[PDB]
Specification:
The chain contains ten helices and three strands; from the N terminus they run H-E-E-E-H-H-H-H-H-H-H-H-H. By secondary structure, the chain is mainly α. The protein binds 2-butylthiophene (Y8G). InterPro entries: Endolysin_T4_type, Glyco_hydro_24, Lysozyme-like_dom_sf, Lysozyme_dom_sf, Phage_lysozyme-like, T4-type_lysozyme.
Length: about 160
C-alpha cells in the first residue's frame, strides 16, 4: 500500500461529474471542481483542468492524471506550511500517508483546527491523538473513512485498508 492506493480506496473512481459527501461537484478520484451550485461552473472548471471540452465526462487516464496532480498538491501544501511540515517530517511513511489523506480531503484550511492533534502526533502519543482526532466534524460526517485514517495514525499499519 501507498498513498495512491489508500486514497483510491477512500475516494473511488467516477468518470462523470458527481457530488461529494458535502454536495459539491466532483469528478474522478475525488477531484473537487467547485463549491458553486452551478453545474455549468463545474463543467467550466473541468474543461480548464483537462484542457479540452469534456461535457462533464473524462477518461480513466485523465482521472488518474488529475489524481496524481491532486496528491502532489497535498504533499507540497504540507511541505510549504510551517505548522504541518515539522509534524509530517516526524512521522513514519505509513503515518505520512494518513497525513496526506487528511489534507487531500480537507485542505490546509480544513485541518487548521487540528493543532492539538498535531501536537499529540508529533509527540507520538498515538492513542491520545486517535481520541482527539475523532472529536471533529470530520469524524462525525465521514466516520468510516475517518476511522480508517485514524487507525492508520494509531497503529502505523495498513490494517484498516487490508480489512
Ligand atoms: C491532523 C492534521 C492533518 C494531517 C497532517 C498534516 C501534517 C502532519 S499530520
Amino acid at each position: 500500500m501507498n498513498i495512491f492506493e489508500m486514497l483510491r480506496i477512500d475516494e473511488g473512481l467516477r468518470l462523470k461529474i458527481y457530488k461529494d459527501t458535502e454536495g459539491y461537484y466532483t469528478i474522478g478520484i475525488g477531484h473537487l471542481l467547485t463549491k458553486s451550485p452551478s453545474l455549468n461552473a463545474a463543467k467550466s472548471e473541468l474543461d480548464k483542468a483537462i484542457g479540452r471540452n469534456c461535457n462533464g465526462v473524462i477518461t480513466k487516464d485523465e482521472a488518474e492524471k488529475l489524481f496524481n496532480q491532486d496528491v502532489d498538491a497535498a504533499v507540497r501544501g504540507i511541505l510549504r506550511n510551517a505548522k504541518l511540515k515539522p509534524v509530517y517530517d516526524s512521522l513514519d511513511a505509513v503515518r505520512r500517508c494518513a497525513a496526506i489523506n487528511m489534507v487531500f480531503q480537507m485542505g490546509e484550511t480544513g485541518v487548521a483546527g487540528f493543532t492539538n492533534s498535531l501536537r499529540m502526533l508529533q509527540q507520538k502519543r498515538w492513542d491520545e491523538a486517535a481520541v482527539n482526532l475523532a472529536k471533529s466534524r470530520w469524524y462525525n460526517q465521514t466516520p468510516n473513512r475517518a476511522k480508517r485514517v485514524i487507525t492508520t495514525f494509531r497503529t502505523g499499519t495498513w490494517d484498516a485498508y487490508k480489512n
